[PDB]
């Protein structure tokens, strides 16, 4: 089953896993141990299944929201870097991976969705969501569409749902209150209703997913899309003249994307904990390490101060930071898994008309 004197790493397929593998080779030539990087589908859901018993990777990469649940289940090893090392990263990134007063992962990058647009189809991006319907009608006459993004993952629709007031768990008394969910308040209803109407009026298809949206934008068929930094690499290859800017506002309010801190956790059942900490602390969290990953697929803003200093000059990164500042960092509480599953169902069902917005959100709230 598990293997000692070896490092198995899991990371999402849309990230720079080939770049990460290069950092792995560096580690291998210095320590002698081989590093295998894999990118299984739905790894965030398989991890708890294999880790719960005798299996799983040594290191797992994913946004910090899922880590609270893993920790509560005892699937992650506690991390205790010295305070000096902690000072090489921004304080809020460590708070994102802190659970029950203990660090349970190494923060890597700060991720936020931005509005990406094709300058040859739309020289000036819309400042408001309400302007999209009219914009689409104009483009439809030319055989094009205004906007396409992954509707199957709630992460992409959340910025709109939260824009006018929607929220996940209210934070009060120094903790998230799981009995106070805001996915069905006035703001959330207004946001999802706007999305449902956009679909009803044929300004977007309810079946649009990541692949469909990415192909449409990279082929120059749709004027805009909503995605993260990791997607910029594929667009550069398409030669499309694109810009990355602030998400449109809704009801005069800015869109509020959920900010994720890409983090690296160590399997509690791993026999190579010290090796894993050395790889993350000494090899990945360095200018050269992050640069190798970034070169493959952009990480966006990074937790490492020294490297962020070099990336902050990129206008695309500035846009990423602006959307992140208008959004909110995701909670890492155990209930996040349920929250995401609930909202995923609500958005899909409401978008396709299989459920009313009110019943869909009421069920998600529950």
């Amino acid at each position: 089953k598990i293997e000692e004197g070896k490092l198995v790493i899991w990371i999402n397929g849309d990230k720079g896993y080939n770049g990460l593998a290069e950092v792995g080779k560096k580690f291998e030539k210095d320590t002698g141990i081989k590093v295998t990087v894999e990118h299984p589908d739905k790894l965030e859901e398989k991890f708890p299944q294999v880790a719960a018993t005798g299996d799983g990777p040594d290191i797992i990469f994913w946004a910090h929201d899922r880590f609270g649940g893993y920790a509560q289940s005892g699937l992650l090893a506690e991390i205790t870097p010295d305070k000096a090392f902690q000072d090489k990263l921004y304080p809020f990134t460590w708070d994102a991976v802190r659970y029950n007063g203990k660090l349970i992962a190494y923060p890597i990058a700060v991720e936020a969705l931005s509005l990406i647009y094709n300058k040859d189809l739309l020289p000036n991006p819309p400042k408001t969501w309400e302007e999209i319907p009219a914009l689409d009608k104009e483009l439809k006459a030319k055989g094009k569409s205004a906007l396409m993004f992954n509707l199957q993952e709630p992460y992409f629709t959340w910025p709109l749902i939260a824009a006018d007031g929607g929220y996940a768990f209210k934070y009060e008394n120094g903790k998230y209150d799981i009995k106070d969910v805001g996915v069905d308040n006035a703001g959330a209803k207004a946001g999802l209703t706007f999305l449902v109407d956009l679909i009803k009026n044929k300004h977007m298809n309810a079946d649009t997913d990541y692949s469909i949206a990415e192909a449409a934008f990279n082929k120059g068929e749709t004027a805009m899309t909503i995605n993260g930094p990791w997607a910029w690499s594929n667009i550069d290859t398409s030669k499309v003249n694109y810009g990355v800017t602030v998400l449109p506002t809704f009801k005069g309010q800015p869109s509020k994307p959920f900010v994720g801190v890409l983090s690296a956790g160590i399997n509690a059942a791993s026999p190579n904990k010290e090796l894993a900490k050395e790889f993350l602390e000494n090899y990945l969290l360095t200018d050269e390490g992050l640069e190798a990953v970034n070169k493959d697929k952009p990480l966006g803003a990074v937790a490492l101060k020294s490297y962020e200093e070099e990336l902050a000059k990129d206008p695309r990164i500035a846009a990423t930071m602006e959307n992140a500042q208008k959004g909110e960092i995701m909670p890492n509480i155990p209930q996040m898994s349920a929250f995401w599953y609930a909202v995923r169902t609500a958005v899909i069902n409401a978008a396709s008309g299989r459920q009313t917005v009110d019943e869909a959100l009421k069920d998600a709230q529950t």
Binding site: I178, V183, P334, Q335, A338, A342, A364, Q365
Partner: peptide
């Protein structure tokens, strides 16, 4: 459903 396990 959001407050469940």
């Amino acid at each position: 459903n959001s407050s469940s396990n």
